[PDB]
Structure 1
Amino acid sequence: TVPGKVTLQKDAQNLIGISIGGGAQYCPCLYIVQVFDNTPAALDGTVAAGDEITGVNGRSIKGKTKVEVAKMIQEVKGEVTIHYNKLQQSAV
């Protein structure tokens, strides 16, 4: 677990270019599921598939659904600071 944050410029459609997963009844943690090609997320290159989302613009995501965190990100315009954890996976 190496912690961080990064600020991504929204594109013209007010998207940074990620899907967020988790935040379900028994799975409190929130994760970046895909980084879509050719989006600001994709081009900065800090975050990746599998990284955990700990915060948006200086605010926890603790106990929120993926929708609520998706809203937290839409509502921010122009740029957005995604708090994360780079995480390991086990290949199989």
Structure 2
Amino acid sequence: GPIRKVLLLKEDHEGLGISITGGKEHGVPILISEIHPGQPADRCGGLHVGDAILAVNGVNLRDTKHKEAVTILSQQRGEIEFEVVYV
């Protein structure tokens, strides 16, 4: 599908509210496998199961290993911009 830019608002006591799978070491993108109900990703409205996360706050995640992506994603705070695509 089309590449999309999506804004997520997270408070400091919260996680993102997603599960991710995949990573470069497995030859697949960082993929959203779950959107947890009522948490920030669900509330933002624009992130969905099956979306590949291409970048977050301008940091490319296309070639990142799984744990690299976890570190990068969990570091982001507040108003967080995602670049995603559903394939």
TM-score, scaled to structure 2: 0.86
Alignment of 1:15-30 (within 5 A): 15-30=15-30
Name stretches of at least 5 consecutive residues in structure 2 with no aligned partner. none
CA RMSD after TM alignment: 1.6
Which structure features the higher share of helix residues? 2
Q: Which residue of the partner structure matches residue 51 of structure 1?
A: 51
Contact 1:24 1:65 in 2 (8 A): yes
If the length of structure 1 is used for normalisation, what is the TM-score?
A: 0.82
2:3 aligned partner, one-letter code: P
Q: Which amino acid aligns with 1:5?
A: K
Pair 1:72-2:72 in alignment: yes
**Residue 65 of structure 1: how far off its partner (Å):** 1.6
Query: How many residues in Structure 1 have an aligned counterpart in Structure 2?
Result: 87
Distance 1:25 1:47 in 2: 24
Q: Which has the larger radius of gyration?
A: 1
C-alpha deviation, 1:51, in angstroms? 0.8
Q: Structure 2 CA distance, aligned partners of 1:46 and 1:62?
A: 19
One-letter code aligned to 1:76:
Q
Change (3 A) 1:8 1:75: same
- Between the aligned residues of both structures, percent identity stands at 26
